[PDB]
Design a protein around this ligand. Sequence first.
Ligand SMILES: [Ca+2]
Ligand SMILES: [Ca+2]
Ligand SMILES: [Ca+2]
Ligand SMILES: [Ca+2]
Ligand SMILES: [Ca+2]
Ligand SMILES: [Ca+2]
Ligand SMILES: [Ca+2]
Ligand SMILES: [Ca+2]
Length: 137
Amino acid sequence: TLIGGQGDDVLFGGDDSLVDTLTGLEGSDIFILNDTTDVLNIDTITDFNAAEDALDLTDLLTGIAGSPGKDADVDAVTQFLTENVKVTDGHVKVGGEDVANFGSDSNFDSNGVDGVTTADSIKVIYNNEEYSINIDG
Ligand SMILES: [Ca+2]
Ligand SMILES: [Ca+2]
Ligand SMILES: [Ca+2]
Ligand SMILES: [Ca+2]
Ligand SMILES: [Ca+2]
Ligand SMILES: [Ca+2]
Ligand SMILES: [Ca+2]
Ligand SMILES: [Ca+2]
């Protein structure tokens, strides 16, 4: 159980084999997630707020054949992330697998209107740069 504070934190449970519970609290927090092979070992993010927080998914994305390398620009990265990161209300998946379990204080309404729809997006970090990926369904 790894808890931030009211500022802008960076939270990480480790490149481990165990469930951690991650809570960002106020502020715009980055949750760094590890890729596991056992989907039962993935972390819980208790309070992801899509209008503020972000997910660093580099570790889940880098081992996909053809992932963008050191010479990629932000349009190539955007195209890759669009194809590979599936964002829905309460879920984020890579390769059909959940990156994390999102807990009951999460909110995927990034824009503050219409609840959660395809107009909403999440902030995804790949190689220390940030991208907005829309809800796709
Ligand atoms: Ca915080
Ligand atoms: Ca841990
Ligand atoms: Ca963990
Ligand atoms: Ca937060
Ligand atoms: Ca807030
Ligand atoms: Ca995995
Ligand atoms: Ca470079
Ligand atoms: Ca919305």
